[PDB]
Amino acid sequence: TTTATRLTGWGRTAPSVANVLRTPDAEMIVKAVARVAESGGGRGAIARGLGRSYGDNAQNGGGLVIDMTPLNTIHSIDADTKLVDIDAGVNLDQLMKAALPFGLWVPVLPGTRQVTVGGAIACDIHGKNHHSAGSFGNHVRSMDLLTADGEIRHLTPTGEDAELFWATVGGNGLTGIIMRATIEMTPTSTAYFIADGDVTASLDETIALHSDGSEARYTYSSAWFDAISAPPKLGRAAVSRGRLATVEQLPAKLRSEPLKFDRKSGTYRGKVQNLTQFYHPLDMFGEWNRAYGPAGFLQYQFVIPTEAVDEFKKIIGVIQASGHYSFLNVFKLFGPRNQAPLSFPIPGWNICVDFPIKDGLGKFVSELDRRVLEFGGRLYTAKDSRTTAETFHAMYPRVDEWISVRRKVDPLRVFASDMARRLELL
Ligand SMILES: Cc1cc2nc3c(=O)[nH]c(=O)nc-3n(C[C@H](O)[C@H](O)[C@H](O)COP(=O)(O)OP(=O)(O)OC[C@H]3O[C@@H](n4cnc5c(N)ncnc54)[C@H](O)[C@@H]3O)c2cc1C
Ligand SMILES: C[C@@H](NC(=O)c1cc([N+](=O)[O-])cc(C(F)(F)F)c1)c1ccccc1
């Protein structure tokens, strides 16, 4: 039934060995969880999707890992209610292709479509449209959670099980196995964006452009950010913003199949782009850490609360002065947060950087951790396998609430991961 397998996060770091169950048979999955429960816990079980998380949340050294990628059936698509009912193992690429002809758009899209719905919910992922759409959890209408008791629990965001539902969103698999979910899609009439580009010359300008009220004009916005240049060029950005195009906005040639699947003159208006172009160059650089890992690069993502913009500038300054130089930097202003205790996004200044691994780096990122922490920010479990339980708990003031919910639902700790042990969420 199971295969012992060396697992790592996306960037190939922090390996551990788990027994991997890989079956399309939901009943075998139910049986396996039950068997772990009847052994009284042991080293537990965790779900795994496509392994795009950079962290150690989708592995469980010495225990069970359940590869959910074979549960990939799309059960129903409904264009009136905009609801799709899909297995947790279906990936966003797969769903995007299946839903487009219905005029439905995946409501939150990360930098790669090679993630499962289960992984999307478990890490409450965010996209270029976060300030307008919230995160992936905001669009979950129901989900079926296989819990430690071996029961499949139907959860809703306002029902009697709302508490468990919202601990599952962003819960990193630690409430049980998401089997299946119903997602509310976004109506669209085309598969293209109409984009506006702007290039800033400085950090202050980047921040000004994000605080001048223009963000409200775009459903989607992100920026490519300079973290190496000496000030005042430090913080300058290439900002890509836009919204889904209506068919009248499409160039003549493309109006045929509008829902088709798949230095400083970087300034433009009303350019029409498909998903790949609009998100460029995220797709071509996505394999980077995996291609040169585990020894090449350390990704590092954090968000600082909106009101702490000065503290945010200081961290950027510290990064530039450090000697650790990152070219791949993505920046965004997050919008309002949701109600999941462990959700990563909060409104504020979000950036992912990617350091070359060098002498002094580990010590340096521990320094960043402290600053992010004190300034009221957080790290993201999808991007971390290095921080401490103390640091993480301090970054998530709702962690004890979350742990309490996890205790109600998994008293024997049937669910466990390397991450849960490292960060003391277990
Ligand atoms: C190139 C690249 C770009 C990215 N861009 C973004 C981005 O723009 N925004 C963003 O928020 N993230 C981004 N990520 C991170 C990624 O979206 C998340 O880590 C996501 O959870 C990965 O999904 P997965 O199916 O691969 O999950 P895995 O990596 O396999 O697992 C991640 C977590 O989900 C849990 N899980 C998976 N399936 C289930 C299930 N069926 N039931 C219960 N729990 C489950 C696992 O236990 C684990 O805790 C990116 C990653 C890469 C490699
Ligand atoms: C790891 C991966 N991240 C992203 O694509 C990404 C990160 C972020 N982020 O939160 O830093 C946001 C986005 C967004 F919002 F635009 F969808 C995408 C990546 C890929 C290629 C270059 C740099 C980062």
Side-chain angles (χ1 to χ4, degrees), residues 2-30 32-34 36-37 39-150 152-159 161-247 249-252 254-259 261 265-306 308-313 315-369 371-426:
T2 73
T3 299
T5 312
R6 183 182 186 270
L7 301 174
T8 62
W10 185 246
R12 303 185 191 280
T13 183
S16 69
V17 177
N19 304 118
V20 173
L21 176 65
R22 184 181 161 79
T23 172
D25 183 6
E27 285 285 335
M28 284 305 107
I29 295 174
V30 171
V33 169
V36 166
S39 75
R43 266 181 92 77
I46 204 67
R48 179 171 179 102
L50 276 167
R52 261 63 175 170
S53 169
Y54 287 72
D56 57 346
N57 49 345
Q59 53 195 98
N60 186 23
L64 179 67
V65 160
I66 303 183
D67 179 349
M68 297 298 294
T69 68
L71 278 194
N72 65 343
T73 302
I74 295 175
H75 301 271
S76 75
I77 300 193
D78 188 317
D80 297 340
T81 69
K82 282 78 69 183
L83 305 175
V84 302
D85 179 356
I86 76 287
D87 283 343
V90 344
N91 70 71
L92 297 192
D93 201 51
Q94 176 187 1
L95 176 58
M96 170 177 148
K97 171 169 177 173
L100 263 175
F102 288 82
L104 302 185
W105 188 250
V106 176
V108 171
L109 287 162
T112 179
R113 290 162 265 179
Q114 287 300 297
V115 312
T116 66
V117 174
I121 299 180
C123 282
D124 193 15
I125 65 174
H126 51 275
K128 194 165 171 182
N129 63 342
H130 183 272
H131 67 288
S132 69
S135 50
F136 200 88
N138 301 51
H139 305 268
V140 176
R141 288 272 303 262
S142 76
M143 63 181 142
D144 292 351
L145 180 68
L146 173 57
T147 42
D149 54 28
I152 298 186
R153 218 116 126 203
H154 190 81
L155 312 185
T156 64
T158 61
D161 257 325
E163 181 180 78
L164 178 52
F165 176 101
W166 287 105
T168 302
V169 170
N172 293 270
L174 293 166
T175 62
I177 296 163
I178 305 158
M179 295 300 280
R180 181 163 171 168
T182 292
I183 308 300
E184 174 167 359
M185 309 286 279
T186 299
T188 187
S189 49
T190 83
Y192 300 83
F193 293 89
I194 172 172
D196 295 345
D198 294 305
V199 181
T200 62
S202 70
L203 179 49
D204 289 350
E205 194 168 328
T206 297
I207 298 176
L209 174 146
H210 283 83
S211 328
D212 65 10
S214 66
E215 280 288 278
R217 286 197 286 278
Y218 308 100
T219 39
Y220 287 73
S221 163
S222 63
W224 204 259
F225 181 103
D226 185 335
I228 299 175
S229 296
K233 294 304 145 84
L234 176 61
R236 66 175 166 186
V239 188
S240 176
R241 313 195 283 186
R243 48 165 26 79
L244 286 173
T246 53
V247 24
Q249 297 175 318
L250 290 184
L254 266 32
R255 285 198 181 93
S256 168
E257 38 184 323
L259 294 159
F261 173 59
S265 284
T267 295
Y268 51 79
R269 291 288 175 277
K271 180 183 287 187
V272 51
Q273 303 184 288
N274 58 31
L275 176 55
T276 294
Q277 300 168 332
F278 184 58
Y279 271 50
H280 172 87
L282 297 176
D283 286 285
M284 68 169 298
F285 285 121
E287 235 113 55
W288 198 269
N289 271 26
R290 167 154 275 245
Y292 308 116
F297 299 85
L298 182 72
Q299 73 292 328
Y300 192 82
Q301 180 163 0
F302 65 90
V303 54
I304 303 303
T306 315
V309 57
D310 261 27
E311 291 88 321
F312 171 73
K313 288 150 76 151
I315 293 185
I316 303 302
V318 177
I319 283 174
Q320 195 280 331
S322 66
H324 305 289
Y325 301 131
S326 166
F327 276 99
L328 313 168
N329 317 293
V330 194
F331 165 95
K332 202 212 155 26
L333 173 62
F334 283 161
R337 61 160 299 144
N338 66 31
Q339 54 203 292
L342 274 212
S343 187
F344 163 71
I346 62 177
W349 311 102
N350 170 267
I351 189 160
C352 179
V353 299
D354 197 18
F355 305 115
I357 293 177
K358 278 206 325 97
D359 290 334
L361 185 60
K363 199 209 189 203
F364 177 68
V365 301
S366 288
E367 179 57 25
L368 295 179
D369 279 10
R371 298 186 200 227
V372 165
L373 167 56
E374 297 297 352
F375 300 152
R378 60 259 310 279
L379 305 172
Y380 186 15
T381 54
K383 289 291 194 79
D384 169 74
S385 60
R386 50 145 299 277
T387 208
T388 61
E390 176 182 301
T391 294
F392 181 89
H393 279 233
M395 294 175 163
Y396 286 77
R398 294 181 65 195
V399 72
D400 293 332
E401 170 194 340
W402 181 89
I403 285 170
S404 252
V405 183
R406 154 160 172 74
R407 302 266 183 259
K408 284 171 197 134
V409 80
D410 183 17
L412 299 176
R413 306 165 152 199
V414 163
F415 303 99
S417 62
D418 285 4
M419 189 280 281
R421 286 181 292 263
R422 180 177 52 88
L423 301 183
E424 284 171 27
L425 299 183
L426 172 78

Short mmCIF file of all heavy atoms in Angstrom, two decimals, residues 328-374, unseen atoms left out:
data_model
loop_
_atom_site.label_atom_id
_atom_site.label_comp_id
_atom_site.label_asym_id
_atom_site.label_seq_id
_atom_site.Cartn_x
_atom_site.Cartn_y
_atom_site.Cartn_z
N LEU A 328 15.10 38.29 -7.60
CA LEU A 328 13.71 37.86 -7.73
C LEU A 328 12.88 38.34 -6.54
O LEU A 328 12.79 37.66 -5.50
CB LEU A 328 13.63 36.34 -7.87
CG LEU A 328 14.62 35.74 -8.88
CD1 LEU A 328 14.70 34.21 -8.76
CD2 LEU A 328 14.28 36.16 -10.31
N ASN A 329 12.29 39.53 -6.68
CA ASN A 329 11.51 40.10 -5.60
C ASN A 329 10.10 40.45 -6.07
O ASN A 329 9.92 41.18 -7.05
CB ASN A 329 12.18 41.34 -5.02
CG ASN A 329 13.66 41.16 -4.84
OD1 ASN A 329 14.10 40.36 -4.02
ND2 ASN A 329 14.46 41.89 -5.62
N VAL A 330 9.11 39.92 -5.38
CA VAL A 330 7.72 40.21 -5.69
C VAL A 330 7.12 41.00 -4.54
O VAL A 330 7.28 40.65 -3.39
CB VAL A 330 6.92 38.93 -5.93
CG1 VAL A 330 5.58 39.26 -6.59
CG2 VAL A 330 7.70 38.00 -6.80
N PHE A 331 6.42 42.06 -4.89
CA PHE A 331 5.87 42.95 -3.90
C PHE A 331 4.38 43.14 -4.16
O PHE A 331 3.93 43.14 -5.30
CB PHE A 331 6.62 44.27 -4.02
CG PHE A 331 5.97 45.43 -3.32
CD1 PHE A 331 6.34 45.77 -2.04
CD2 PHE A 331 5.03 46.21 -3.97
CE1 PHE A 331 5.76 46.86 -1.40
CE2 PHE A 331 4.44 47.28 -3.33
CZ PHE A 331 4.81 47.61 -2.05
N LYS A 332 3.61 43.32 -3.09
CA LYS A 332 2.18 43.57 -3.22
C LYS A 332 1.65 44.20 -1.95
O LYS A 332 2.17 43.94 -0.86
CB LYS A 332 1.43 42.26 -3.47
CG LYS A 332 0.09 42.47 -4.11
CD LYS A 332 -0.93 41.45 -3.71
CE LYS A 332 -2.32 42.05 -3.89
NZ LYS A 332 -2.33 43.12 -4.94
N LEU A 333 0.62 45.02 -2.09
CA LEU A 333 -0.10 45.51 -0.93
C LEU A 333 -1.32 44.63 -0.72
O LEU A 333 -2.26 44.66 -1.52
CB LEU A 333 -0.53 46.96 -1.13
CG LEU A 333 -1.45 47.59 -0.08
CD1 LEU A 333 -0.79 47.62 1.28
CD2 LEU A 333 -1.88 48.99 -0.51
N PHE A 334 -1.30 43.82 0.34
CA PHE A 334 -2.44 42.97 0.69
C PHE A 334 -3.63 43.81 1.12
O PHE A 334 -3.47 44.92 1.63
CB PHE A 334 -2.08 42.00 1.83
CG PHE A 334 -1.25 40.82 1.41
CD1 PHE A 334 -0.52 40.09 2.35
CD2 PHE A 334 -1.21 40.41 0.09
CE1 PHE A 334 0.23 39.00 1.98
CE2 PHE A 334 -0.45 39.30 -0.30
CZ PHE A 334 0.27 38.60 0.65
N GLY A 335 -4.83 43.27 0.93
CA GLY A 335 -6.03 43.92 1.45
C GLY A 335 -6.47 43.33 2.78
O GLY A 335 -5.69 42.70 3.49
N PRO A 336 -7.75 43.52 3.13
CA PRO A 336 -8.31 43.02 4.39
C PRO A 336 -8.10 41.52 4.56
O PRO A 336 -8.14 40.78 3.58
CB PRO A 336 -9.80 43.35 4.25
CG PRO A 336 -9.82 44.58 3.34
CD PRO A 336 -8.73 44.31 2.35
N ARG A 337 -7.87 41.09 5.80
CA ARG A 337 -7.68 39.68 6.11
C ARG A 337 -9.02 38.98 6.28
O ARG A 337 -10.07 39.63 6.28
CB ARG A 337 -6.85 39.52 7.39
CG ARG A 337 -7.48 40.15 8.64
CD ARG A 337 -6.89 39.56 9.93
NE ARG A 337 -7.15 38.12 9.97
CZ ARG A 337 -6.34 37.20 10.47
NH1 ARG A 337 -5.17 37.55 11.00
NH2 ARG A 337 -6.69 35.92 10.42
N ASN A 338 -8.98 37.65 6.41
CA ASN A 338 -10.18 36.86 6.66
C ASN A 338 -10.17 36.31 8.09
O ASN A 338 -9.32 36.69 8.89
CB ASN A 338 -10.37 35.75 5.61
CG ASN A 338 -9.27 34.67 5.67
OD1 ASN A 338 -8.71 34.38 6.73
ND2 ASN A 338 -8.98 34.08 4.54
N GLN A 339 -11.09 35.41 8.40
CA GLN A 339 -11.27 35.01 9.80
C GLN A 339 -10.51 33.76 10.26
O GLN A 339 -10.65 33.37 11.42
CB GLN A 339 -12.76 34.94 10.16
CG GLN A 339 -13.60 34.07 9.25
CD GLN A 339 -15.09 34.44 9.27
OE1 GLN A 339 -15.79 34.24 10.27
NE2 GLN A 339 -15.59 34.96 8.15
N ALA A 340 -9.73 33.14 9.38
CA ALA A 340 -8.89 31.98 9.76
C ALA A 340 -7.77 32.42 10.69
O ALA A 340 -6.95 33.25 10.30
CB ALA A 340 -8.30 31.30 8.52
N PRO A 341 -7.74 31.86 11.91
CA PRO A 341 -6.74 32.24 12.91
C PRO A 341 -5.33 32.21 12.34
O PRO A 341 -4.58 33.13 12.64
CB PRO A 341 -6.88 31.14 13.98
CG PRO A 341 -8.27 30.71 13.88
CD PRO A 341 -8.66 30.83 12.42
N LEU A 342 -4.99 31.20 11.54
CA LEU A 342 -3.61 31.06 11.05
C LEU A 342 -3.39 31.53 9.63
O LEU A 342 -2.36 31.20 9.04
CB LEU A 342 -3.12 29.62 11.10
CG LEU A 342 -2.50 28.99 12.32
CD1 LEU A 342 -1.49 27.98 11.79
CD2 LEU A 342 -1.87 30.03 13.21
N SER A 343 -4.34 32.25 9.07
CA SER A 343 -4.16 32.82 7.74
C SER A 343 -2.92 33.74 7.68
O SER A 343 -2.72 34.58 8.55
CB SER A 343 -5.42 33.58 7.32
OG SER A 343 -5.33 34.00 5.97
N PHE A 344 -2.09 33.57 6.66
CA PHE A 344 -0.92 34.44 6.49
C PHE A 344 -1.21 35.92 6.15
O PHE A 344 -0.68 36.81 6.82
CB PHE A 344 0.11 33.82 5.52
CG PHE A 344 1.13 34.81 4.99
CD1 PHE A 344 2.13 35.32 5.82
CD2 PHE A 344 1.10 35.22 3.65
CE1 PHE A 344 3.08 36.24 5.34
CE2 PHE A 344 2.05 36.14 3.15
CZ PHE A 344 3.03 36.65 4.00
N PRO A 345 -2.03 36.20 5.12
CA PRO A 345 -2.20 37.61 4.74
C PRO A 345 -2.86 38.50 5.79
O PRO A 345 -3.82 38.11 6.45
CB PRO A 345 -3.08 37.53 3.49
CG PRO A 345 -2.73 36.16 2.89
CD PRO A 345 -2.63 35.29 4.12
N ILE A 346 -2.30 39.69 5.95
CA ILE A 346 -2.93 40.77 6.68
C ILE A 346 -2.75 42.00 5.81
O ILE A 346 -1.85 42.02 4.97
CB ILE A 346 -2.29 40.99 8.06
CG1 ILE A 346 -0.82 41.40 7.93
CG2 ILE A 346 -2.46 39.75 8.93
CD1 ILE A 346 -0.15 41.71 9.26
N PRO A 347 -3.61 43.00 5.96
CA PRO A 347 -3.44 44.17 5.09
C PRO A 347 -2.08 44.79 5.34
O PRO A 347 -1.69 44.97 6.49
CB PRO A 347 -4.58 45.12 5.53
CG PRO A 347 -5.06 44.59 6.85
CD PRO A 347 -4.80 43.11 6.82
N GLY A 348 -1.34 45.08 4.28
CA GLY A 348 0.00 45.58 4.46
C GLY A 348 0.99 45.25 3.36
O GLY A 348 0.64 44.73 2.28
N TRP A 349 2.25 45.55 3.66
CA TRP A 349 3.32 45.51 2.68
C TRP A 349 3.94 44.12 2.58
O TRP A 349 4.63 43.67 3.48
CB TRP A 349 4.35 46.58 3.04
CG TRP A 349 3.66 47.88 3.29
CD1 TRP A 349 3.39 48.44 4.50
CD2 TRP A 349 3.10 48.76 2.30
NE1 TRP A 349 2.72 49.63 4.33
CE2 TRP A 349 2.53 49.84 2.99
CE3 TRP A 349 3.04 48.73 0.91
CZ2 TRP A 349 1.90 50.89 2.33
CZ3 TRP A 349 2.42 49.78 0.25
CH2 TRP A 349 1.85 50.84 0.96
N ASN A 350 3.66 43.44 1.47
CA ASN A 350 4.10 42.07 1.31
C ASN A 350 5.24 41.93 0.31
O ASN A 350 5.18 42.46 -0.80
CB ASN A 350 2.93 41.18 0.88
CG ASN A 350 3.39 39.79 0.47
OD1 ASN A 350 3.64 39.54 -0.71
ND2 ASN A 350 3.53 38.89 1.43
N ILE A 351 6.27 41.19 0.69
CA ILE A 351 7.34 40.95 -0.26
C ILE A 351 7.99 39.58 -0.10
O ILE A 351 8.26 39.12 1.01
CB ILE A 351 8.43 42.07 -0.23
CG1 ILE A 351 9.42 41.89 -1.39
CG2 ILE A 351 9.17 42.07 1.08
CD1 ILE A 351 10.21 43.15 -1.75
N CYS A 352 8.23 38.93 -1.23
CA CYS A 352 9.03 37.73 -1.23
C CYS A 352 10.36 38.05 -1.90
O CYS A 352 10.40 38.62 -2.98
CB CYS A 352 8.31 36.58 -1.94
SG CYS A 352 9.27 35.00 -2.02
N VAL A 353 11.46 37.71 -1.23
CA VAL A 353 12.78 37.85 -1.80
C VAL A 353 13.46 36.48 -1.84
O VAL A 353 12.97 35.52 -1.23
CB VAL A 353 13.66 38.83 -0.97
CG1 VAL A 353 13.04 40.22 -0.94
CG2 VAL A 353 13.87 38.29 0.43
N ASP A 354 14.58 36.40 -2.55
CA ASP A 354 15.27 35.13 -2.73
C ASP A 354 16.79 35.30 -2.63
O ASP A 354 17.44 35.71 -3.59
CB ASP A 354 14.87 34.52 -4.08
CG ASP A 354 15.19 33.03 -4.18
OD1 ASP A 354 15.41 32.37 -3.14
OD2 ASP A 354 15.21 32.53 -5.33
N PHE A 355 17.35 34.99 -1.46
CA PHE A 355 18.78 35.16 -1.21
C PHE A 355 19.61 34.00 -1.71
O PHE A 355 19.26 32.84 -1.51
CB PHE A 355 19.07 35.33 0.29
CG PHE A 355 18.31 36.44 0.94
CD1 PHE A 355 17.37 36.17 1.92
CD2 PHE A 355 18.54 37.75 0.58
CE1 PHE A 355 16.67 37.19 2.52
CE2 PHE A 355 17.84 38.78 1.18
CZ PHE A 355 16.91 38.50 2.16
N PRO A 356 20.74 34.30 -2.36
CA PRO A 356 21.77 33.29 -2.60
C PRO A 356 22.29 32.81 -1.25
O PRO A 356 22.51 33.63 -0.36
CB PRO A 356 22.87 34.07 -3.32
CG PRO A 356 22.18 35.24 -3.93
CD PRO A 356 21.07 35.59 -2.99
N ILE A 357 22.48 31.50 -1.08
CA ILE A 357 22.98 31.01 0.19
C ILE A 357 24.46 31.35 0.32
O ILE A 357 25.27 31.03 -0.54
CB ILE A 357 22.70 29.50 0.37
CG1 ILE A 357 21.20 29.29 0.51
CG2 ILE A 357 23.43 28.96 1.61
CD1 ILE A 357 20.80 27.85 0.62
N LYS A 358 24.80 32.04 1.41
CA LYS A 358 26.13 32.57 1.65
C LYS A 358 26.42 32.57 3.13
O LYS A 358 25.49 32.53 3.95
CB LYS A 358 26.23 34.01 1.16
CG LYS A 358 26.49 34.19 -0.31
CD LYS A 358 27.17 35.53 -0.58
CE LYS A 358 26.70 36.63 0.38
NZ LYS A 358 27.61 36.83 1.55
N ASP A 359 27.70 32.66 3.48
CA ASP A 359 28.11 32.74 4.87
C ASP A 359 27.43 33.93 5.53
O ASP A 359 27.40 35.03 4.97
CB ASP A 359 29.63 32.84 5.01
CG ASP A 359 30.33 31.53 4.65
OD1 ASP A 359 29.71 30.45 4.76
OD2 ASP A 359 31.51 31.58 4.25
N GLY A 360 26.85 33.69 6.70
CA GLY A 360 26.16 34.73 7.44
C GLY A 360 24.67 34.86 7.16
O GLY A 360 23.98 35.61 7.84
N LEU A 361 24.17 34.12 6.17
CA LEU A 361 22.78 34.28 5.77
C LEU A 361 21.81 33.86 6.87
O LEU A 361 20.85 34.59 7.17
CB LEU A 361 22.47 33.53 4.47
CG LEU A 361 21.05 33.73 3.89
CD1 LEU A 361 20.80 35.21 3.57
CD2 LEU A 361 20.79 32.86 2.66
N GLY A 362 22.05 32.70 7.47
CA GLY A 362 21.14 32.17 8.47
C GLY A 362 20.97 33.12 9.64
O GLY A 362 19.86 33.37 10.11
N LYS A 363 22.09 33.66 10.09
CA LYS A 363 22.10 34.63 11.17
C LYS A 363 21.36 35.90 10.74
O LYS A 363 20.57 36.47 11.51
CB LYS A 363 23.56 34.95 11.51
CG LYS A 363 23.77 35.56 12.87
CD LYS A 363 25.00 36.46 12.85
CE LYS A 363 25.37 36.92 14.25
NZ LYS A 363 26.17 38.18 14.24
N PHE A 364 21.60 36.33 9.50
CA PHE A 364 20.91 37.50 8.98
C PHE A 364 19.38 37.36 8.91
O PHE A 364 18.67 38.30 9.25
CB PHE A 364 21.42 37.92 7.60
CG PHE A 364 20.67 39.09 7.02
CD1 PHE A 364 20.78 40.36 7.59
CD2 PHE A 364 19.84 38.93 5.92
CE1 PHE A 364 20.09 41.45 7.07
CE2 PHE A 364 19.14 40.02 5.40
CZ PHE A 364 19.27 41.28 5.98
N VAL A 365 18.88 36.21 8.45
CA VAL A 365 17.43 36.04 8.35
C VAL A 365 16.76 35.91 9.72
O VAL A 365 15.59 36.27 9.90
CB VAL A 365 17.00 34.88 7.39
CG1 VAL A 365 17.53 35.13 6.00
CG2 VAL A 365 17.48 33.55 7.91
N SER A 366 17.52 35.43 10.71
CA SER A 366 17.04 35.42 12.08
C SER A 366 16.86 36.86 12.56
O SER A 366 15.96 37.18 13.33
CB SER A 366 17.99 34.65 13.00
OG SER A 366 17.90 33.26 12.73
N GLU A 367 17.72 37.74 12.08
CA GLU A 367 17.58 39.15 12.40
C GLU A 367 16.32 39.74 11.73
O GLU A 367 15.58 40.50 12.36
CB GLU A 367 18.86 39.92 12.01
CG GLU A 367 18.80 41.42 12.28
CD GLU A 367 18.51 41.77 13.74
OE1 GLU A 367 18.79 40.94 14.63
OE2 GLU A 367 17.98 42.88 13.99
N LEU A 368 16.08 39.36 10.48
CA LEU A 368 14.86 39.80 9.80
C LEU A 368 13.64 39.31 10.57
O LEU A 368 12.70 40.08 10.78
CB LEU A 368 14.81 39.32 8.35
CG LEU A 368 15.88 39.90 7.42
CD1 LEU A 368 15.74 39.34 6.01
CD2 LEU A 368 15.85 41.44 7.41
N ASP A 369 13.66 38.04 10.97
CA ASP A 369 12.57 37.43 11.73
C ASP A 369 12.18 38.32 12.89
O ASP A 369 11.00 38.65 13.07
CB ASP A 369 13.01 36.08 12.30
CG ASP A 369 12.94 34.95 11.28
OD1 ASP A 369 12.73 35.20 10.08
OD2 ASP A 369 13.11 33.80 11.71
N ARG A 370 13.18 38.71 13.67
CA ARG A 370 12.97 39.55 14.84
C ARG A 370 12.29 40.87 14.48
O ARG A 370 11.36 41.31 15.16
CB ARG A 370 14.30 39.79 15.56
CG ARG A 370 14.19 40.36 16.97
CD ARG A 370 15.57 40.54 17.59
N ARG A 371 12.73 41.49 13.39
CA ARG A 371 12.18 42.77 12.95
C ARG A 371 10.75 42.64 12.45
O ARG A 371 9.89 43.45 12.79
CB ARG A 371 13.05 43.42 11.87
CG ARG A 371 14.44 43.74 12.35
CD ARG A 371 15.27 44.51 11.33
NE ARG A 371 16.69 44.36 11.64
CZ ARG A 371 17.56 45.36 11.68
NH1 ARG A 371 17.17 46.60 11.42
NH2 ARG A 371 18.84 45.12 11.98
N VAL A 372 10.52 41.63 11.63
CA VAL A 372 9.19 41.34 11.12
C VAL A 372 8.25 41.15 12.32
O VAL A 372 7.17 41.73 12.38
CB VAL A 372 9.18 40.08 10.23
CG1 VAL A 372 7.77 39.58 10.01
CG2 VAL A 372 9.88 40.38 8.90
N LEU A 373 8.70 40.34 13.26
CA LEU A 373 7.97 40.06 14.48
C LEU A 373 7.60 41.34 15.25
O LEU A 373 6.42 41.64 15.45
CB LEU A 373 8.79 39.11 15.35
CG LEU A 373 8.34 38.94 16.80
CD1 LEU A 373 6.89 38.50 16.83
CD2 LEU A 373 9.23 37.94 17.52
N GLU A 374 8.62 42.10 15.64
CA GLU A 374 8.40 43.32 16.41
C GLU A 374 7.53 44.34 15.69
O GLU A 374 6.80 45.11 16.33
CB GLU A 374 9.74 43.95 16.82
CG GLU A 374 10.59 43.08 17.76
CD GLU A 374 9.93 42.81 19.11
OE1 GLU A 374 8.86 43.41 19.43
OE2 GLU A 374 10.50 42.00 19.88
#
